[PDB]
Structures are given as C-alpha cells and as structure tokens.
Amino acid sequence: FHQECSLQSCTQHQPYVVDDPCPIHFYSKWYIRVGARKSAPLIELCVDESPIQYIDIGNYTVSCLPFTINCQEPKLGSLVVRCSFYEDFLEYHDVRVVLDFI
Amino acid sequence: FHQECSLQSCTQHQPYVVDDPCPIHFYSKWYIRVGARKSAPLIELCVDESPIQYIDIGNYTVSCLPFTINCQEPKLGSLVVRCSFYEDFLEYHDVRVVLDFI
Amino acid sequence: EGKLVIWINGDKGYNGLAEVGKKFEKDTGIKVTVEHPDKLEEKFPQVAATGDGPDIIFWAHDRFGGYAQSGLLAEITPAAAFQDKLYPFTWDAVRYNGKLIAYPIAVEALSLIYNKDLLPNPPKTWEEIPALDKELKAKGKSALMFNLQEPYFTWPLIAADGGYAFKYAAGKYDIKDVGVDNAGAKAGLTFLVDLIKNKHMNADTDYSIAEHAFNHGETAMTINGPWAWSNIDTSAVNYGVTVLPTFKGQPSKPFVGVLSAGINAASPNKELAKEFLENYLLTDEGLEAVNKDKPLGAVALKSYEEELVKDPRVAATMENAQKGEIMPNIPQMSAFWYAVRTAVINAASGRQTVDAALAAAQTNAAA
Amino acid sequence: EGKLVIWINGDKGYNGLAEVGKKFEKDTGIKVTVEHPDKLEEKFPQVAATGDGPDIIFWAHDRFGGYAQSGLLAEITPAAAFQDKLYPFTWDAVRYNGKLIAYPIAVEALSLIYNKDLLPNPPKTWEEIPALDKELKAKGKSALMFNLQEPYFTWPLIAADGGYAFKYAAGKYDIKDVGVDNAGAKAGLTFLVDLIKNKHMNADTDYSIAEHAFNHGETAMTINGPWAWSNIDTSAVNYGVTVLPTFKGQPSKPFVGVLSAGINAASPNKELAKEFLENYLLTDEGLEAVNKDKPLGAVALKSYEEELVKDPRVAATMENAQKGEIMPNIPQMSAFWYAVRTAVINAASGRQTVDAALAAAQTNAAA
Ligand SMILES: OC[C@H]1O[C@H](O[C@H]2[C@H](O)[C@@H](O)[C@@H](O)O[C@@H]2CO)[C@H](O)[C@@H](O)[C@@H]1O
Ligand SMILES: OC[C@H]1O[C@H](O[C@H]2[C@H](O)[C@@H](O)[C@@H](O)O[C@@H]2CO)[C@H](O)[C@@H](O)[C@@H]1O
Ligand SMILES: *[C@@H]1O[C@H](CO)[C@@H](O)[C@H](O)[C@H]1NC(C)=O
Ligand SMILES: *[C@@H]1O[C@H](CO)[C@@H](O)[C@H](O)[C@H]1NC(C)=O
Ligand SMILES: N=C(NO)NCC[C@H](N)C(=O)O
Ligand SMILES: N=C(NO)NCC[C@H](N)C(=O)O
C-alpha cells in the first residue's frame, strides 16, 4: 500500500534534497498542483519533454537531479510527485510532500 | 567522477538492503563476476529479459526490488552493479561492492 | 470521421474480422480497417493517452482496468436483451468501477496439449511427468515444454494448491490481500523448479522454443491456448487438447482471460463501433468468420458457444476455464504480473530460492 | 553477405547517395541499399550491440566515441595519401583512443539565416535583437525564432563569453573539467532567458515551429544548419546565410560536428565499405551527387570543399565553424547533453534561475 502524504523535515530557506517517496521501480516526476486544488492544473518543475509556457518558479528548485528545493512551501500551490510504474505508465499514484521546518 | 569501489557494512548472514552506488538517472543491474576475474563472464542476479541457464545462487539474493542480499561475500565471485545512463545505455560504469562485516 | 479502425493481435483471425468489416461496409458504406500492430497492449495506451489511436482495440480484459482508470475506454450500455446473449461472468470481467467498458468476445484458458502418437494416454497428474520424461529421454524426446518466461503459463500449477492473485471481497479487489507466497504457491513453484534441477525442463524455454519443439514432434506435451492451435494444425502433429494435470490432487487453476473489444474514448465513431460489435461481430455468423480464419476457442456469445463446444478442444478449454480464476482487471495487475514474472524466472534459473522469490514478490505485488 | 546496407538521416540527400551506390553496383555487382530510419543514432547502438544492423551509418562524430567504447565501429586505416585529401582536424574528430573509427564526410556548424526582404542588413550583435523585435512586432512579425529544445542550438551564445564542454588537455578530454556554469555561460543563458521574459521569444519554440515561422515569412531570422537549406529553397523566402551574431563583443561559438561514415564492427563487408567510402563517395563526383540532392554544407574533402566554398552559404558555414569548437566524442557527452538540455529548457521556461540551472548541470555533467 502506498502512502498519499509524505511529511518531511528541513531547515527553512536552505537547500534540501527531497526524500523520494516513490517506490523502487517507479519513475518520479515532480509537480506543483496550482493552489493545492485537485481540479487545477499540474505545473511540471523539471521539463523533460504539450505546450510549455514560461512560469517564474523563482528560487524554488535548486536541482532536478537529484530533486532539490530551497526548503519552503511553494507559493504556487502544493508539491506533488507522481510515481509511475516502470513497466506500465498507467499504474501511477501521487504523493503530496509536506514540510515541517526545523 | 564515479567511484569504482563501494565499501559497505552489514551484519553477516542477515538480510541487508544494498546501498545503491549508481547515480540518480542511472539504471542499476546487479551481477556476479565469476571468480572476480575481469575476463570471466557476468552472471545476472535478477533476470529481467541471450541464453539463460540454471545456476544455484543459493540464499544469496533475498530480493531484487529492492536489491537485498543475505549479507556475505558471494561464493561465485565478486558483486558488481552496472550503472547505465537513462538516456544512453552505452554510457555505463561498473561499481564493485565490498562488505565489511559488523 | 465516418470510418472504423480496429486493432487486434496478429495471431488471431484478422482476415475473418475484415470480412465482417466488409459486410458492415456493404450495409452502411463505412469502411472498416483491421490492423495488427505489434505490442497493441502497449501501443494503445500510448497513442490513446494523447487522444489518438484506433476506434476498437481487442485485448484480454485484465488490461482494461488500467485503461479505464485513465479514461481511455468509452462506457458501453448494451440493451438488456443483448446482455443476456452473453454469459454473465464475461460482463463482470469487463466492468470497472460500475461501468461496462468493453464487449466480451472470447473466453480464454490454458489447456494441456499432447502429441497423440508419442503419448496416447496423457498423464492426469503433474507428479508423474518426471518419470514420463525419464522414459522419453531414452528415446531422445521430452515430456513437457511450455513458456516459462510468462507467469500466465506457470500460474495454473502455482494456484492449484492455494495460490491466488488479488482476493475478491465485498464487490471489490483488495490490493493488500495477495496470495503468491502462501503454501500452495510455494509447493507449486517448487515442483516446477525441481523439474528444472532434475533436467526435465530448461530454464530458458520460452514461447517460441516450446512451440517449435511440440510442433516438430520433439516433445510430447505443451501448455497453450487457442491462439496456438492454427500452427499445430498445419504442422501435421496429431494432437489433442485436454484438461490440465492435477497437482497434489487439486485441479490446475489457469487464469481465465476474456478477449474483449473496447471502444476508444477519443473515438468519433462510438455509435458505429457499438453497431459493428453488437449487430455484426457478436453474432453466430460474425464470430464464425473470425473463428474460421483462426480459432477463438470458447466464446462469450452463448448461442455460438453451444456450437463450438462440440469441438473437444473448445470443450477442454471450457473445463479448464471452469476450474480457473478470472483475472482481476485492477491497475495493480501490472505490478502483480511483473512481481510474479520475476519471481518465477528467478526461481526457475536458480537466482533465488522459491521461498525468497515468492516472499519478495508478495511484498511488491501487495504494495 | 556481398551487399552494402547504409543508414543515413532522412533530411540528407539519400537519393544522391544511392546514385553513388548504383555506380558502385555497376563496377562491382555489389548492390548498395540506402535507408533512412528514424532515430538511427538510437537504433544503431541497439541493433549493433546484438551484432546486427547496417554496414555503414552516417552520423555526427560526437556519438561515435560511445559507439567505439562498446566496440560497435570497425577501425579504419586509410593510406596516408588518402588522409591528406581531408582536412586534418576532421580526422581528429573521428579518432577514439588512438584509432580512427569513421570517415569524415561533412563539417557542420550553425549559422544565422535571415529573410532578406524583411531584414536586408541582419544584425551583427545579439544585444540589438531585442530592439529589432520590438520594431517588427509593430508589423506583426518577430526578429528571431530557433529551436530552444536542443542545447546544440543555444550553445553558440552560451559559449561565446566563456562557456565550454569538456576541456582538452594533454591529448585527452578531462571528464571533471566542464565549463557550463562559469561566468560566460551564465551571461549567455541569462540573455536568452531575458529574451523570453521580455516576450521576444517563446519558451516552447522547437525545430518545427521555428522552421515553419521562418519558411513562411513570419520571422526575420533563424539559427540552423545546412540540413535546413532545402526546405527554405522551395519556400520562396529570399534568405541569406551569414556569421552568427556576437555577444559581449565575442563571436558566437557553435559546436562543430563532423558528419562521418562509420563501419559496423559486425559487418562482413568491411573491405567493400572501405572501398565504397574512399574510392566512390569521398570524391568530387560522389560528394557532388549527395550535395546535389540535398546540400551538405561544407565538406571534409578539401578538393571539393574548395568548390563548395564559392557558395556564400558554405562560406558562412566555414567562418562559423572556424569560430566554434569541435564536439568532444567521449561517452560522457550523453550526460553532458542531457545536463545542458535540461538546464537551458528549465531556465527558458522559468523552472529554474540561470545560476541554479547551470550549477546543477555543471555538477551532473562533470560527474
Ligand atoms: O503473463 C502475464 C500476461 O498474462 C496474460 O496474457 C496472456 C493473454 O491473455 C493470452 O491471450 C495470450 O496472449 O497469452 C498471454 C500470455 O503471454 C495477460 O492478459 C497479460 O496482460 C499478462 O501480461
Ligand atoms: O542538442 C544536442 C545534440 O547536438 C548535436 O546534434 C545536432 C547534429 O549534429 C546536427 O547534424 C543536426 O542534426 O542538429 C542536431 C541537433 O538537434 C549532436 O550531434 C547530438 O549528438 C546531440 O544530441
Ligand atoms: C527564496 O525566495 C523566497 C521569496 O518568497 C524567500 O522568502 C526565500 O528566502 C528565498 N530563499 C533563498 C534565496 O534561499
Ligand atoms: C547462506 O548460505 C551460506 C552457505 O555458504 C551460509 O554460510 C549462510 O549462513 C546462509 N545464510 C542464511 C541461511 O541466512
Ligand atoms: N502532466 C500529466 N497530466 O496532466 N501527466 C499524466 C501522466 C499520467 N500517469 C497518465 O498517463 O494519465
Ligand atoms: N550482460 C552484459 N554484457 O556481457 N551487459 C552489457 C551492457 C553494456 N552496458 C553494453 O551495452 O555493452
């Protein structure tokens, strides 16, 4: 069974390598769900490959590999990782990442 | 720069989830190099997909996902993981895993 | 669009299906195009996730729940009079979250296939196959070869003494109740691993090797389904199709697959697809054209199945299906399939013991 | 086998290459087959790792070091008289660990391409493109569109003020000496990101969008190579090919690619492939047939390049090549390319700042 939520601890406003909640043999892709509203769109934080538009994410994403953020709640909405099974991209689940500041 | 060797610690003869030395965005596939001789063949420990033959690996491999061994030196040879880049399987490097027993 | 595009596997009778498509074209002017691309079960979700692809895809029902969770399949609502023309359990196999999402066509189950000339009395038990292989080896033959690379083919033996995929309880499948590492699965897989250690089977036997061996009289038995009958027919091996052997007194429990016709959610010809499937294909004459090209085995249309069951191969398919289990269609079947596939092959080739392989596969599949 | 199979990209003159193949067939009876599959640079290592594939593959030299480290390419040993017919730096681009592993054919570098009717005096500096876009926007046009999705196209600006891939020192490339996050790369990428924030470019512009815009008179400039000339030719846009604009007073430094012909290590026609490449293709008449079909730009055969350089498009290609950098061919180019591609697109689309994107790409590419 896969958790829906992932509660993690980091020092605010400093780099933080996010602990990946996706299981082994699942691909991780990180998004922001606008306004944390499930009916709102997903903004991809790491453009791999479908209209791409400029959105200022600011200082949020330090690196995409490994996924590293400046430890903070995103202004645009909630942080979400989609976990997609290696053998079948139709088997997927979303984990919301929530930060407790040290 | 990628290390050639990976020295790890586990309690002998007990399950141990191997710390994966492959970088993020590299695929990990685990082998035994027969007799630790570089000119000898590689035996795959986790058959994904080329003639497959029965070889008794015994109790060595507890699980392939995540890669978990009964903590011991393999009888057949050295433990090797091949790290293959996601975007290009021709960019690869091997890491030898060596165990210090607690 | 005003046109019907259909995707179906290449080992099935696509020329007969096109004949049903020609007749549909004579009655409506709508051209029906039948294609058999490789890896449709992979190609379709790829092209249908972008809103493209064929109007109708034919595939085993277990994949369609993953399709429906991503909204790739149109919901169908056939009239009650039409639903009654098909066996009720087939409709259950194509229901996802309360919605019917495809039309059942054929009911597939693995059977034992044996060379009548080498083996006129095929064995009733798995337990006597080692001694039979020992005998045939002194003649340069073998008793049994079948595809060890796909867990669909090893599941009948694995499930016979207690194994199961996802438990069905209270109208739903429980993701956390998986039965691949219980005592019956361990005993089933141990028997198969023992066949390999005692050199009655090779760990690298796949679909092609097992088919070539049986179709050329080199092995006395194989385990396959109706899609394989055509190649044995032209091979001039004198063969029979019978009930799978028992294990520890229990019947082999093959997975039951319902070959089903799903309509693309992005299709603009939804009503023409429903018209073609109900009033042209799912009839005695429509199914006969497809079956005449390449046999379907048993079918979901009861009126034509009552005709096909006279064929003893289809009768054996029915009997094996009655002793088996319907495949779940939940999206976690992909992680289930991968878990069991890796465990069987790792145990077959000596990479893991049976207990270790099944325990780890249990943990992953139930995750 | 007694036959020659050749793989070359589809945007190049494969019909002219087949004419050189017909003539080879008239002289030797060996049929020469030319194919243009999609994703050859991916298809070849796949099929050649299993010992199969074409006899000859045409691709930019930077991929061939990854081929040679896995032994996919045959070593070539041309006579010294033949080596002298090609510019020495091209032989350096197809040398891996001391071995020549392909035949140079063409020398590729990006150039500025401009619409003569919209823009008869194309700008000499990057810095004046914003004001030129502001002007053309009041006419419903734009100044510049080029493929932002591939870092090959942004590298000329990134490297102009100090950026570099892998440093060449003591006859080898240093995996740990990468220059994508120095001051010149940061300033180059910041200028491009500013073009997007000020709405002079869109972050989703790719190869197709930029080509369609320029070829239909909608934008005044684009940045491309000789493979794109044919489509502009039939488009009836009156265009010129000139030197890339400077940035902060420094020339743009495009990556220089040597289109090269490598021989499959698993080929049984190795001597026929060497015969075809040396004595038939790498001649004035052989290169002319290919160039006549679709222009190669500049070429590595000095005798025919002295003829092509009369074309001002080829002259501009040479000048841009002289100001650029030869691509390294080491296998880590794949991680380099992916690192720079992700950083440029993330900075272009606002996902990362320039400093953060380049710093992280530096760490990964130098790993
Ligand atoms: O082995 C897992 C595999 O089993 C089933 O595939 C069957 C299919 O249903 C039959 O029609 C026939 O083609 O044999 C196949 C086994 O190779 C599942 O339908 C499939 O999803 C699953 O991967
Ligand atoms: O963007 C990275 C890419 O750059 C080069 O590809 C060039 C190629 O050399 C040209 O002939 C033409 O096709 O444009 C390509 C850019 O899309 C490298 O050769 C290639 O390996 C690399 O991925
Ligand atoms: C990132 O930007 C936010 C702006 O809301 C700021 O609060 C935070 O301190 C910044 N973190 C840095 C610069 O590391
Ligand atoms: C695994 O087998 C080896 C045999 O050499 C043995 O030494 C070890 O104790 C075993 N570990 C177990 C059973 O956990
Ligand atoms: N960015 C998105 N969706 O909006 N990705 C969706 C991927 C998802 N697993 C699918 O195939 O349905
Ligand atoms: N099992 C093996 N080799 O023996 N795998 C080799 C994979 C390797 N990276 C290659 O493509 O060359």
mmCIF file of N, CA and C and ligand atoms in Angstrom, chain B residues 31 42 82 84 89-90 92, chain D residues 49 70, ligand 6:
data_model
loop_
_atom_site.group_PDB
_atom_site.id
_atom_site.type_symbol
_atom_site.label_atom_id
_atom_site.label_comp_id
_atom_site.label_asym_id
_atom_site.label_seq_id
_atom_site.Cartn_x
_atom_site.Cartn_y
_atom_site.Cartn_z
ATOM 1 N N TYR B 31 25.211 -7.984 -10.831
ATOM 2 C CA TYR B 31 25.855 -9.153 -11.412
ATOM 3 C C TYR B 31 26.824 -9.765 -10.409
ATOM 4 N N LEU B 42 29.810 -12.369 -16.659
ATOM 5 C CA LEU B 42 28.913 -11.760 -15.686
ATOM 6 C C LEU B 42 27.661 -12.619 -15.554
ATOM 7 N N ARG B 82 26.191 -2.675 -12.524
ATOM 8 C CA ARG B 82 26.438 -1.876 -13.714
ATOM 9 C C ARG B 82 25.448 -0.718 -13.723
ATOM 10 N N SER B 84 23.820 2.194 -15.779
ATOM 11 C CA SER B 84 23.573 2.549 -17.173
ATOM 12 C C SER B 84 22.733 3.820 -17.234
ATOM 13 N N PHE B 89 22.253 3.823 -23.011
ATOM 14 C CA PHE B 89 22.791 2.631 -22.369
ATOM 15 C C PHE B 89 24.263 2.399 -22.690
ATOM 16 N N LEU B 90 24.832 3.132 -23.651
ATOM 17 C CA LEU B 90 26.252 3.000 -23.951
ATOM 18 C C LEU B 90 27.136 3.760 -22.972
ATOM 19 N N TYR B 92 27.998 3.792 -19.449
ATOM 20 C CA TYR B 92 27.814 2.954 -18.278
ATOM 21 C C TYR B 92 29.126 2.860 -17.517
ATOM 22 N N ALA D 49 24.592 -3.619 -30.939
ATOM 23 C CA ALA D 49 25.021 -4.292 -29.718
ATOM 24 C C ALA D 49 24.706 -5.781 -29.745
ATOM 25 N N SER D 70 32.116 0.654 -26.836
ATOM 26 C CA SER D 70 31.437 -0.633 -26.830
ATOM 27 C C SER D 70 31.786 -1.482 -28.047
HETATM 28 N N1 LIG E 6 25.461 -8.606 -19.597
HETATM 29 C C1 LIG E 6 26.079 -7.693 -20.294
HETATM 30 N N2 LIG E 6 27.369 -7.868 -21.020
HETATM 31 O O1 LIG E 6 28.050 -9.019 -21.033
HETATM 32 N N3 LIG E 6 25.561 -6.363 -20.443
HETATM 33 C C2 LIG E 6 26.254 -5.353 -21.220
HETATM 34 C C3 LIG E 6 25.562 -3.991 -21.197
HETATM 35 C C4 LIG E 6 26.566 -2.897 -21.609
HETATM 36 N N4 LIG E 6 26.335 -1.609 -20.998
HETATM 37 C C5 LIG E 6 26.509 -2.758 -23.124
HETATM 38 O O2 LIG E 6 25.572 -2.404 -23.840
HETATM 39 O O3 LIG E 6 27.676 -3.074 -23.744
#
